[model samples]
Target chain A: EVILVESGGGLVKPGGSLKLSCAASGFTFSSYTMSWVRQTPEKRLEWVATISSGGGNTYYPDSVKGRFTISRDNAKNNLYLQMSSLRSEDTALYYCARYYRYEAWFASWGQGTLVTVSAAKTTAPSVYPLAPVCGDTTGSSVTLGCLVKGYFPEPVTLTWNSGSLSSGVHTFPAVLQSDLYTLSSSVTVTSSTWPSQSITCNVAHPASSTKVDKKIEP
Target chain B: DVLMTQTPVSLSVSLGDQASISCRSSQSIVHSTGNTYLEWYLQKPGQSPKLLIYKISNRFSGVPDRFSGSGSGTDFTLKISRVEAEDLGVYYCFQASHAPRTFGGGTKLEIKRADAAPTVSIFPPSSEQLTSGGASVVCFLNNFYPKDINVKWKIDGSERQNGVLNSWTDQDSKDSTYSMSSTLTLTKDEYERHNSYTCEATSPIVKSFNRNEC
Candidate 1:
């Protein structure tokens, strides 16, 4: 079993590139495989690439091949994932992984090393528990709000059972979820089902590839 | 390589509790890194995925003293001898030590509410975004659920202000689910000091909340 600890240094903003380090300790560095996974600002996880601990035989996620390259030097006992093509959507937590035959899963992996978009401010008085307002109303007037504090000026939609919200009156508040964050929405089945039945509120953000949903029981 | 998947039941837990589950990979993640490509993650429901262990054995810096990861090759294990109340759902193990990096299906760890009602569980995204300018930073995201979210931008220990953001939702057109996105912008000086920012999306089900962050 190999253990991976990550190097917590280095930075490259948007329109730039970064070579983050995933150091291997507690095991023979050359005995495992090295891979790169990216968790973007939107909280979405994506497979970046994979490499050999001994040689640089890299395989990238076909969906994002041109942007990533994997390499390593056994002497340093450090695995590296070089991410390029800087974009606002490129900031993420990169992890190094290895394959395990006995474990049946990614048995050993690297502690995450974070990389952010260039030129972004890291300081801000932020708040948590951004419980966006989700309301169930009657007569086609149903609005489930994601009262996030930091969300601003972007497009958002609310869905019912993962569908475009049909015609129904919906409302949203500014900065509902977290400090300076706000929410977006979509409508579906523009009927009293919103208030009479249960409506789900799932908001899609810019930095993430996952969906965040809340159920509103009227 | 095969992708591993594990579905945990809860989000957070109390000390002395057992948090256990099985992880399956898409293909064997075994590589020539002495099996060092494997790693496990713990996100206290609605938080970013924090590195618990890497290279399959060693711990990351600043990790809590209690959290531990043990397992080798393809089948790995992450155990919290005594689950801390703060330690909760959506635990994942990724095979980055190898290529075609894959993630185990996530598990949720929580206090185990009496109902077992199976609260609404939201999965994290498969993609995300980022941007930075001289002293400023911004990000965009997708594929995650529960618009109720948070973006943590830290450049050390202090909090940052003056960050701007936007978000939107749309149908996948391919998949039958709705997709959403959020955009955020900040300054460059902040990037130089604390360029690391994690965007997290949280989904609460029962007594647990599952979160995915960058």
Candidate 2:
């Protein structure tokens, strides 16, 4: 059995406050304590605070003394960390770790959700055109490339589709586009024949439901 | 706390090559339930950190298979079969097997550079109407590689080391290159005198600007 942890939150600005919730599944909620940890772009991982599984007793670091509040909803099996009077340094990846022992290691971890603390608020990403180039003329396969640009925050998802191929699509990991992000993927037609039509590149993000797609003709 | 210690503060990898990062915890990250709550994350410049591996070796959903995790007890490894340009950044190993969860200091992923160069430009304030208020000048650097670059501002051929300057360097999410932008604020008198602001960026790129250039 797999125990999964997912983090839910979005952007936050300086002086603003945010409450992030962590939901745990596949385990008993009362078995362990839930901890809140953070990692900054400066590359330091700091323990923010923690709350007991029964939703009683809380602990915090001296730095976050009066600024962070740790709470939990035992019935819902969820943990919450609320931070106020945010600073740019408060921007980091926050995770909820399930404690296995009173003063030992955590046995499970929530997905590291990003919380940005900037002077200027962040905006949703806007993907640019998808450019696909064909290559490998001698081989039985042809490669298609796609590009997505002008996106914000970090991490964007890219997918590719072509009617000719089976199994799954081959897409590259998204890269950083300065303040935004971009992704490029190349799909190879494995069969001896070329694809009958064009291949589409789909770019998706969590903050926005609308997706960007661009097609390339082989 | 479960201390996950990582070595080699930095790593330089060639594009399309393989690379590996190691994390050694102070104690076993495995739990009595036979689960290891160890994970890997990558944080690009000016961006948030992201999880790439979880449960020691299980690749997160949608993560590229090229990234693999292994090892047991206190030793762990994150291997990238083929390093992509986008892979440049800081890699961290986090342990959830203990309370007060801790992370490794982090390892930086650098691109193997070639004879590459950066392009620099300075955009003076657009709003020409200025009396006693302040204005801003922007210096931009683009089309660089290897993810390591720096930018600085100068006035009248002298480096302006003080004052508040807003700047950030970022990876070109599309091509895995690097770019940075810095903005310098100035008073009306400084703007009226044609302060002759110049930008000195690290390596292969440098440019200067004056009030007339606005």
Candidate 3:
């Protein structure tokens, strides 16, 4: 029997996957099982999955049937959650829910972090009615900007579809240029990767607040 | 999980003296809520505890202005800069804003004398919204005697905005208490919205909105 207490945050991108983390704090690392519980004002608590604290045994409820998986790295005492095809309503704070037999209820809980997806619409270059693609081009290199602000830091992928932006061998890179956190990537592609193709950005955070992705041309 | 430890077992003072209470939390109680969960309380000689200030430095309904609370994240201190005839008893610090709630040991406040009457003290002060511009909110003991506590003030409900931060600080270490005040700098719009405003004091045991002074 063990007690697993952890702390961390979560994040997700639109049209992308979710990243959630649970850190163990003040508890036996190998004793208790780490579980994810879904909660909302309408439905109190719903169990999502349980990741083994011992080795590698995982279980998930039918409610989260597909596009869901849990992973743990014992060295860091942290757990991660991933989900694909997300929407706006998916935004919620996720806690590292610990279950103990003697505990009257699911007693121990970690505070949640709030993650809001940003897809602001502007008229300056009118991307709302059309697919938005922002790019800074130089002599032989072009840098594409895929902005996702205030997201729990994680790895993301950006692809260029169709047009000059979608050519050969393109890479989506994210940079925290200023206080405002902007992500972007550059690539070498031909007409094969352009024309009606899609450039996407995906991320994973401890708080499965949802992910963001958009199709743009370079 | 950090453990909280406090010191200076007790204090002793005469009516209308000065006093102070020092409360320290082992870890930073600073939460994302932007408010420390720690609160101050008072327990008269033999009575139950009473709430003095909650969320670190915000007084409840009916507490007097003579009691003041200050200090940030980890090391917090509550002080009663001046004493009054009706302020005498024990004080304590408690954590109420988070889980697995915990309270500081205890600090006793006694009135110096050959013998005093049946007196009682309350933990956690109370606060009140005045009906008039200068309403006085005073905490009280229903029937208990012994008077010698303290009260003060801070502006806009902040711990250090400054009106007069006071605590009971006697020469002796055993007798001390705390209180504070905030003169509602009502604007013309505020005065039109509501009339009377007063400072209050209270106990943690009772269930009713008991106001010692108005």
CAPRI rating of model 1 = incorrect
Q: Is candidate 2 or candidate 3 better by TM-score?
A: 2
Q: Compute the lDDT of residue B151 as modeled in candidate 1.
A: 47
> Could you give candidate 3's per-residue lDDT for residues A1-218 as a string of tens digits?
22343333334456566567777667664676676655332212334567766747877655454766877777777777776666555554455555443221233455443333334211111010111122222234322223233333332333334333443222222222222232323333233443335554443332334434444443
- Tell how far residue B14 is off in model 1, in angstroms: 12
DockQ of all candidate complexes: 0.04, 0.09, 0.01
Task: Give me the TM-scores for chain A across all models, comma-separated.
Answer: 0.52, 0.79, 0.45
The digit string of per-residue lDDT tens for model 1 on A1-218 reads 45677664334567687777877777776877766667665455777766665675767776667886778888878887666787767666776766543342344556566665655432222111111123323344333322233443232344545664544313232333332344433343444555566666655543333346666442
Please provide, for model 2 over B1-214, each residue's C-alpha lDDT reduced to its tens digit, 9 standing for 90 to 100: 5567897689877789999999998766577776667888787764556667877887765679899998676779999998888788888887766755677999988767564465555554433324325555555455566555666777777756445343334444455565545546567676667657777776335676554331
Query: Going through the candidates in order, what is chain B's TM-score?
Result: 0.46, 0.76, 0.49
Q: What is the alpha-carbon lDDT of model 3 when measured against the actual structure? A: 0.44
Winner by TM-score: 2
lDDT of each: 0.50, 0.64, 0.44
